[PDB]
Amino acid sequence: MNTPKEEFQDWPIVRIAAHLPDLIVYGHFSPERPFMDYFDGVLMFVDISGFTAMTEKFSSAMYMDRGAEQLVEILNYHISAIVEKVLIFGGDILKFAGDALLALWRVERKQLKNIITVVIKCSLEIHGLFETQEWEEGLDIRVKIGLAAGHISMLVFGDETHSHFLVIGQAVDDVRLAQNMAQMNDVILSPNCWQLCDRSMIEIESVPDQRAVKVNFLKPPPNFNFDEFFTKCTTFMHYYPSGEHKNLLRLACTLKPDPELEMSLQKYVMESILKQIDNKQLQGYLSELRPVTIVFVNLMFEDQDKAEEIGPAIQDAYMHITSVLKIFQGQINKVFMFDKGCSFLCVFGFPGEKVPDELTHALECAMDIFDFCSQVHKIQTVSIGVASGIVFCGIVGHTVRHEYTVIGQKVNLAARMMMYYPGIVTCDSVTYNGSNLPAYFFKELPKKVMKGVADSGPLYQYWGRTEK
Numbered sequence: 001m002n003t004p005k006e007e008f009q010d011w012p013i014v015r016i017a018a019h020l021p022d023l024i025v026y027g028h029f030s031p032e033r034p035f036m037d038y039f040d041g042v043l044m045f046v047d048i049s050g051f052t053a054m055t056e057k058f059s060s061a062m063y064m065d066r067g068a069e070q071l072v073e074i075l076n077y078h079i080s081a082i083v084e085k086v087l088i089f090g091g092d093i094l095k096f097a098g099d100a101l102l103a104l105w106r107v108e109r110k111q112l113k114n115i116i117t118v119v120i121k122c123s124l125e126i127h128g129l130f131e132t133q134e135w136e137e138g139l140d141i142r143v144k145i146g147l148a149a150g151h152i153s154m155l156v157f158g159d160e161t162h163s164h165f166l167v168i169g170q171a172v173d174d175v176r177l178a179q180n181m182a183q184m185n186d187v188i189l190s191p192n193c194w195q196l197c198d199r200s201m202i203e204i205e206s207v208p209d210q211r212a213v214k215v216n217f218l219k220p221p222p223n224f225n226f227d228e229f230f231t232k233c234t235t236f237m238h239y240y241p242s243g244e245h246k247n248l249l250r251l252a253c254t255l256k257p258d259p260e261l262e263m264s265l266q267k268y269v270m271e272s273i274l275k276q277i278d279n280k281q282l283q284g285y286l287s288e289l290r291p292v293t294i295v296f297v298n299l300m301f302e303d304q305d306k307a308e309e310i311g312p313a314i315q316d317a318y319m320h321i322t323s324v325l326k327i328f329q330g331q332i333n334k335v336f337m338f339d340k341g342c343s344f345l346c347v348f349g350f351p352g353e354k355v356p357d358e359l360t361h362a363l364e365c366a367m368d369i370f371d372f373c374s375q376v377h378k379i380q381t382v383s384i385g386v387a388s389g390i391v392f393c394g395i396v397g398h399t400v401r402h403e404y405t406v407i408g409q410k411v412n413l414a415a416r417m418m419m420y421y422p423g424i425v426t427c428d429s430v431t432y433n434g435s436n437l438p439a440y441f442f443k444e445l446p447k448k449v450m451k452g453v454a455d456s457g458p459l460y461q462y463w464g465r466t467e468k
């Protein structure tokens, strides 16, 4: 008999799994929300610095109304190469957000030393992709990489139809602090990463007024062979594609239909993405430069390094946030947590073809969230930034590992407003002026220099309907 070969791999469950890390796809966990798990690993935070400041360039008339299409194409061309490097080096891409991605190598404590060496090699090869690269003339296509290592907690929260996850703890905070110290072309190790690494492998230098270090070179011993070393490291990589599947970037490409697994995984993915996955919407429909209102919510914690306290508090806040968003068709696009602050990137006005009073409603939703979350046990401070304008929306990353993302100066502005103006609901000039709400509903604020923002315009606190 004939033997026609090659397994069919294009099932809905496989398409859904592209939107998720192995941490979730192969997770198998409890029905309870919140769910918490604890492990050790190495984290890599890759920032494509300056990229957002080039989303605004693609709004110009020169792109002839194909700005969003050209933006997603060039971003994915470069980000796909970074993703492929991470995946071939055995990493799990956790999330894409803003200009960045975060990857994880989960391993037992005893293997952390050797895995750091793998992750440094990976980081150097990523830099290597961009060594002789630009577009017009002064294009700064270079990345900044922070690495951290140590204890990691995962939190999964949500309701009967939606799930979200976050990674938490000192290694998570450290990786963002490390990437923030990086200049273009740097690999920065967190203090704990430098403490746990194989110091015979690397030459470092001190970072002024910091315990983190910069990697100058990976200079391995005379008898060292990276390929044979990496092979030894794969013993500890549960899902590294191997044997008959050694030609694949992810084991998740091999997932077979399983309705119970698909029910769990689809909860993490927006309904408009599922519509595209199901071939009920055109594959290009979600790449757009679209006017939206960003409502960026930050929850700061009492018992701040305490994962077992923060989990219930985030779940309780989430249950309220999702009810408020439902009424006015808002969406949670991203959640992430650093420096004991859990942030929700909420968006009013993307795939859906309508919403009339987007601004008064966005402000009222922000105040509702603010009032409720302020009364949640263990939540110390709630801060909300509200900004409105044109943002890029689209699926970013590699065919095998990508996520819907929102990118733009107004997203960065709302993020910076919630950090620089803590404990209040703030809005930009577009939102203030457009709402047509009486001026006494607001307080005009002092202008702050915000790292990353070049002229915010006037900013306002949304004071609310009453003096009290």
Ligand SMILES: Cc1[nH]ncc1-c1ccccc1Cl
Pocket: 052, 097, 098, 099, 334, 345, 406, 407, 408, 409, 411, 412, 415, 416
């Ligand atoms: C840089 C950027 N571009 N678009 C969004 C962002 C962002 C900035 C700070 C925190 C989180 C995010 Cl997502």
Ligand SMILES: Cc1[nH]ncc1-c1ccccc1Cl
Pocket: 047, 048, 097, 098, 099, 100, 176, 179, 336, 338
């Ligand atoms: C470095 C970066 N680039 N784009 C977004 C970010 C970021 C910064 C602080 C916290 C969270 C995020 Cl995602």
Ligand SMILES: Cc1[nH]ncc1-c1ccccc1Cl
Pocket: 094, 095, 096, 097, 100, 101, 102, 165, 166, 167, 168, 172, 335, 336, 337, 338
């Ligand atoms: C999921 C998460 N929890 N804490 C931080 C993050 C994160 C932040 C920025 C980019 C990617 C990720 Cl995974």
